[PDB]
Amino acid sequence: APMRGYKVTDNERTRKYGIGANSLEMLIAKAKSKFPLLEPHLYLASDGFEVSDDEYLKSLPAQTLFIVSGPDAVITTDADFEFEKM
Amino acid sequence: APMRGYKVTDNERTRKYGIGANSLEMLIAKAKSKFPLLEPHLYLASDGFEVSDDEYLKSLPAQTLFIVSGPDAVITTDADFEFEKML
Amino acid sequence: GAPMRGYKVTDNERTRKYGIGANSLEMLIAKAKSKFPLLEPHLYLASDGFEVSDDEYLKSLPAQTLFIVSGPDAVITTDADFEFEKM
Amino acid sequence: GAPMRGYKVTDNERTRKYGIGANSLEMLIAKAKSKFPLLEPHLYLASDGFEVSDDEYLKSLPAQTLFIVSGPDAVITTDADFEFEKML
Amino acid sequence: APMRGYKVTDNERTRKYGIGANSLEMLIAKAKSKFPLLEPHLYLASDGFEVSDDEYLKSLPAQTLFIVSGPDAVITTDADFEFEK
Secondary structure (H helix, E strand, C coil): CCCEEEEEECCCCCCEEEEEECCHHHHHHHHHHHCCCCCCEEEECCCCCEECCHHHHHHCCCCCEEEEECCCCCCCCHHHHHHHCC | CCCEEEEEECCCCCCEEEEEECCHHHHHHHHHHHCCCCCCEEEECCCCCEECCHHHHHHCCCCCEEEEECCCCCCCCHHHHHHHHHC | CCCCEEEEEECCCCCCEEEEEECCHHHHHHHHHHHCCCCCCEEEECCCCCECCCHHHHHCCCCCCEEEEECCCCCCCCHHHHHHHHC | CCCCEEEEEECCCCCCEEEEEECCHHHHHHHHHHHCCCCCCEEEECCCCCEECCHHHHHHCCCCCEEEEECCCCCCCCHHHHHHHHHC | CCCEEEEEECCCCCCEEEEEECCHHHHHHHHHHHCCCCCCEEEECCCCCEECCHHHHHCCCCCCEEEEECCCCCCCCHHHHHHHC
């Protein structure tokens, strides 16, 4: 599978990385080396939906923004995060 | 058939999953793994209509949101779910 | 043959709601019959109650058009009147 | 090897602006550091401040993408914020 | 490397030269014979980014427009014009 670019940050948006990956397994492994998460899971920053498998990952546009967190995580969406900045 | 991405949640919109599938059988099987129902069925979150066969699934846009539930479920639609957040 | 398209079908009371894929009126009626065992199921536009009388009329309609399934010679309750009747 | 691509690099204050050809993130950072002497240079997207974390990400980007070169864990001023303050 | 055509002008954009070159070194050398600059450098007319090496030059389309000026130049770019209007 081809290498694609994705964007990953944590729920507080404290560290922001562009990461290249050709599978969900690779993207999680690269995220795990960057964030203090022992069981990392990837969620859409837009609506909090969990990227549950490699097939869903590859259905997304390149450069999609993900929140990395733990399993079954409460995710602060982009809209919620901006609203909380006021 | 090609893999396409879809979104699945429960009627409470609590747990939310993006799932890739190339058929309705595969989408239901993957949804059942996350939502252990005896007879899982998929419904449009927009209007509650049941996705009754693979041909209907393939007629929908990728990234469509579905509510997973049992058979003959009465789904809370997007519009009524928001309004319930209002109350 | 003809392309598969998605349609929506419900009964006159709007109790059970199905998205159904079909490539002909014959196929759409056969699938509707499995969900609503009426002896001679017929499809009517939910918008204005006009009976889908042949496959050429069906193909003249947009995908995702909503139909009411009922018996023959049925005057169905249109969407406008159904929405009104609960208010 | 990997082909040369053109990229654009400036600093957080947009004081000097360079088009740079590179075939790897390692090369792009080295050429950027020649122009902007920094102890621990990293590249960040000028659009949203996301850090270019590896060569695979760099090569996923369109040619002529604009980067801010800065130190580590940097909070760079995005294009939108910089233009906003410029108009202020 | 193949010869390509480039457009070079000054910051006023009134001394305008089409120049053929197969390297940044050649393009600068030819521009220097036309322009009053001790150390000519090439900048994109669109956004002012300096052509820092031959690899960057070769990444650009033929007939790209450059402003030639000195080092650390103050360039009036197309973006600078769009900003004013």
